[PDB]
Amino acid sequence: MRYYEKIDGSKYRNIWVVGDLHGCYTNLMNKLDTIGFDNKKDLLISVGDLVDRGAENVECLELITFPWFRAVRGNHEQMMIDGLSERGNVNHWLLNGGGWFFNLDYDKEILAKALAHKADELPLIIELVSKDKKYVICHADYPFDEYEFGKPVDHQQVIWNRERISNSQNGIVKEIKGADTFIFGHTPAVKPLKFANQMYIDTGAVFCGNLTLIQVQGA
Ligand SMILES: [Hg+2]
Ligand SMILES: [Mn+2]
Ligand SMILES: [Mn+2]
Numbered sequence: 001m002r003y004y005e006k007i008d009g010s011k012y013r014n015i016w017v018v019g020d021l022h023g024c025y026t027n028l029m030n031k032l033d034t035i036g037f038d039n040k041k042d043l044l045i046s047v048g049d050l051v052d053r054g055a056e057n058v059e060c061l062e063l064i065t066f067p068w069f070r071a072v073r074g075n076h077e078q079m080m081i082d083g084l085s086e087r088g089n090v091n092h093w094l095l096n097g098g099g100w101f102f103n104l105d106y107d108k109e110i111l112a113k114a115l116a117h118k119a120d121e122l123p124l125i126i127e128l129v130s131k132d133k134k135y136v137i138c139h140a141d142y143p144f145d146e147y148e149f150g151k152p153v154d155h156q157q158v159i160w161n162r163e164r165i166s167n168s169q170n171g172i173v174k175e176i177k178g179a180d181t182f183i184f185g186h187t188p189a190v191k192p193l194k195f196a197n198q199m200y201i202d203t204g205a206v207f208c209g210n211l212t213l214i215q216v217q218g219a
Contacts, residue, residue, distance in 0.1 A: 004149050005123035009130035012043040014218030019185040022206035023054020039068040047185030048074025048139040053097035054206045061115045073122035074139040075159040081120045124158045130217045134179040140186035147178025162187050168195035
């Protein structure tokens with residue numbers, strides 16, 4: 001897989017970005033239906049964390065097989081992948097809601113295992129160019145003051161770090177050069193937040209049912 005992945009927005013009509021799903025498949029589908037999403041024209045970008053804690057995990061993970069669904073891996077996808085790895089330890093994954101995997105029927109377990117393999121092909125960062133506007137999507141954060149396509153980075157920081165949102169909430173706010181807007185999930189909040197040119201759209205759908213989707217193009 002490649003850390004960065006570029007998406008040419010001019011190839012789609014409307015483009016949306018959704019926060020952490022954690023098995024909230026039905027919630028998502030109803031939203032798309034409600035916003036008039038057309039999978040033959042529009043594009044949905046995901047911040048990752050498609051599985052764990054929630055109920056419809058396989059259904060959510062499977063979305064990565066659809067052309068209209070473009071996701072970046074979250075720390076939960078990583079824990080699942082490492083956990084299922086030949087020399088991996090499931091401990092961490094089970095301590096984060098991965099139990100659903102060991103509760104699947106035989107058929108689904110096989111499907112889940114194949115989908116986990118595909119999840120390991122997911123990028124860590126997505127660069128979306130839309131109308132001369134550049135949007136960067138990562139699960140938790142882009143650990144640099146300046147963004148640069150292809151710049152090597154520690155994946156752990158991209159998917160686990162909460163230091164930036166933490167300072168932003170403590171008053172310490174700073175912009176990230178290199179792109180117009182940054183969109184992350186990972187850290188839940190009652191309402192979508194925005195500090196400088198950074199947006200946080202994880203409104204804890206698995207916890208309360210509030211799943212947020214922001215439109216970044218069209219309409
Ligand atoms: Hg919530
Ligand atoms: Mn999450
Ligand atoms: Mn997360």
